[PDB]
């Protein structure tokens, strides 16, 4: 089964890409199953809710007592060398929190890295129903 391991924040780059110390080395992590709006985007600069998502992630991680990374059952890195993972702050999944707040949408899903897909789509369906942020 999936398992959580400890990590240490280095810097949040934006809503869904975070630099962490993992196993003694700085690594960039990309959150599994979610896409936050871009703040860096080549074509457009900041997408709507980009800055909001980015500060949500930054605040949640910076104020955490403990951070943990959870790899899924498929590829653990993407072609850019980023770790692919679920991030937890004090036991709360960042990926879900963003979706639940309408600050991210559920990604394109690549089996078999899709263990928590059902749960996040249920939180996305609730954020839409509530018309939050991106769903506003």
Swiss-Prot record:
Residues 116-136 are annotated as: Disordered. Ca(2+) binds at residues 16, 35-36. It comes from the Bacteria. Residues 116-132 have a biased composition (Basic and acidic residues). The active site is at residues 30, 38, 82. It is found in: Secreted. This is Nuclease A. It comes from Staphylococcus aureus.
């Amino acid at each position: 089964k999936l398992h959580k391991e400890p990590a240490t924040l280095i810097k949040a780059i934006d809503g869904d890409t975070i630099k962490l110390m993992y196993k003694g080395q700085p690594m960039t992590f990309r959150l599994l199953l979610v896409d936050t709006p871009e703040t860096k985007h080549p074509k457009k600069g900041v997408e709507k809710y980009g800055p909001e998502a980015s500060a949500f992630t930054k605040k949640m991680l910076e104020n955490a007592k403990k951070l943990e990374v959870e790899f899924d059952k498929g590829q653990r890195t993407d072609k850019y060398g980023r770790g692919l993972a679920y991030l937890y702050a004090d036991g709360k999944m960042l990926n879900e929190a963003l979706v639940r707040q309408g600050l991210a949408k559920v990604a394109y899903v690549y089996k078999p890295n899709n263990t928590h897909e059902q749960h996040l789509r249920k939180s996305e369906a609730q954020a839409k129903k509530e018309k939050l942020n991106i769903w506003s």
